[PDB]
A paper describes a structure:
In most bacteria, iron homeostasis is regulated primarily by the ferric uptake regulator (Fur). Fur, which was first discovered in Escherichia coli, is a global transcriptional regulator that directly controls the transcription of over 90 genes involved in iron uptake, storage and metabolism. Several holo-Fur structures have been solved, revealing a modular domain organization including an N-terminal DNA-binding domain (DBD) and a C-terminal dimerization domain (DD). In this study, we present six crystal structures of apo-Fur, holo-Fur, Fur in complex with the Fe2+ transport protein (feoAB1) operator and the P. aeruginosa (or E. coli) Fur box.
Numbering used by the authors:
A (entry chain B), B (entry chain A): 1 to 134
The structure:
């Protein structure tokens, strides 16, 4: 098969050039929330004709198309992942910038109830935990 | 006879100029997490000699001195409040930008367990809820 991101591109009728295929594959493979520079090093290592400008343009395309989600965990560094098929939040090692995903149905339910008590429906939220190793 | 923020400047040995006093008063009085433009409008209504540049510099001074906390609820728009005595999180109306503060000891406990289970101690977190009125 083609990468998950390539398939999403086909679904939306966007052109799949050689270089876009490489970038889509890099991003589908990655689960570590790479920044644009990291996507670039991975992509250009596969196809050396890929420039950082093309990676910027391609990541913007994916973000515009809701294929990628972007995070800034505090340090102003944009980090990217596929639109997850399951909601999760993030715990970040403040020393190494390692990101861990977690889900807490209990917190999700508590958030929605807090919104309800205040007369609101929740349309979005951001939960980030900042940690140092025990 | 002084605002809470002016008291903090007194505790730090910092000169309270007339313009610092007005800006401190505006911020101590504000409960709506104002941006800098809004602080400016309120300060300049009290004393029309105060320029927008002075407001920006003074808010920056207060933030650097840990007298104010700065929030960016996702849009890049900096909003301010006195450094809170008690921890709270925020629910934001995505239509009006109105901010509601809340606490949830149950959520706070769950966050601690989540960090622990992944081998971390929590040094900080960010929880923002985005709502629309029911
Ligand atoms: Mn969540
Ligand atoms: Mn993620
Ligand atoms: Mn909290
Ligand atoms: Mn607050």
């Amino acid at each position: 098969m083609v990468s998950r991101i390539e398939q999403r591109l086909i679904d939306k009728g966007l052109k799949v050039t050689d270089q876009r295929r490489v970038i889509a594959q890099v991003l589908s493979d990655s689960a570590d929330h790479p920044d644009v520079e990291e996507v670039y090093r991975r992509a250009t290592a596969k196809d050396p004709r890929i420039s950082i400008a093309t990676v910027y343009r391609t990541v913007r395309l994916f973000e515009e198309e809701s294929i990628l989600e972007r995070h800034d965990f505090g340090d102003g560094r944009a980090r990217y992942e596929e639109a997850p098929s399951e909601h999760h939040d993030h715990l970040i090692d403040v020393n190494s910038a390692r990101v861990i995903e977690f889900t807490s149905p209990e917190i999700e339910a508590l958030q929605r109830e807090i919104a309800r008590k205040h007369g609101f429906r929740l349309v979005g939220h951001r939960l980030e935990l900042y940690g140092v190793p025990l």
